[PDB]
């Protein structure tokens, strides 16, 4: 397993504009298009992202391209973030994937505020980190996904994904 398969599981894949768990316009593998309630606006951002008149539908290859860009951007965001990088650099490969998933989902800003969890993680206090991570709106809103990611972080294995 790896980061890509990991997020492809958690995000699914949809070729038509759809609304996410928060009701925002999204497409592909979790590619948020806009927080605006306007489909038009969303269709406009879609066309801008793709480079063509999509009419709100993309192909699989197009969805995967956006996905590669987003995973890439997530990693770079982590490395460019002074609160995140040191955490990231201290982790093994599996746990790094867990932190990338959270950033992909919540944004760098969002993740950098799990201050307390980040410190336990950096200290390698897995179980404690795990309990602290569950005390969050993130977990109450998307509990099944949150649990898979938290288990990953805690154990450093891919068991939650098998």
- Known binding-site positions: 32, 104, 117, 132
Q: Hunting for tokens 């650099």 — which residue is that?
A: 89
Closest approach, Cβ 14 to Cl ion, in A, equals 16
Site string for ligand [Kr], 115-134 (x = CB under 6 A): --xx--x-------------
Under a CB-based contact definition with an 8 Å cutoff, are residues 30 and 63 in contact? Answer: no
90: helix, coil or strand? helix
Active-site hit among 5, 10, 11, 61: 11
Active-site hit among 5, 10, 20, 64: 20
Strands (DSSP E) along the chain, which ranges? 14-19, 25-28, 31-34
- Annotated catalytic, 62? no
DSSP state of 136: S
**Inter-axis angle of helices 3-11 and 60-80, nearest 10:** 120
97 forms part of the interface with ligand [Kr] (CB under 6 A): no
Q: Hunting for tokens 């592909």 — which residue is that?
A: 28
Q: Which of 25, 88, 114, 138 binds ligand [Kr] (CB under 6 A)?
A: 114
Name the binder of 112 from Cl ion, ligand [Kr], none, CB < 5-8 A by kind: none
Contacts with ligand [Kr], residue ranges (CB under 6 A): 114, 117-118, 121
């Amino acid at each position: 397993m790896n980061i890509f398969e990991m997020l492809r599981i958690d995000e699914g894949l949809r070729l038509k504009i759809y609304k996410d768990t928060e009701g925002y316009y999204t497409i592909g593998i979790g590619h948020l298009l806009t927080k605006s309630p306007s489909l038009n606006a969303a269709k406009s951002e879609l066309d801008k992202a793709i480079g063509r008149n999509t009419n709100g539908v993309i192909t699989k290859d197009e969805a995967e391209k956006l996905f590669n860009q987003d995973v890439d951007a997530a990693v770079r965001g982590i490395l460019r973030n002074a609160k995140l990088k040191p955490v990231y650099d201290s982790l093994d490969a599996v746990r790094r994937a867990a932190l990338i998933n959270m950033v992909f989902q919540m944004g760098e800003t969002g993740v950098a505020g799990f201050t307390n969890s980040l410190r336990m993680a950096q200290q390698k206090r897995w179980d404690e980190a795990a309990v602290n991570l569950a005390k969050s709106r993130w977990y109450n809103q998307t509990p099944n996904r949150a649990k898979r990611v938290i288990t990953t972080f805690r154990t450093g294995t891919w068991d939650a994904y098998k």
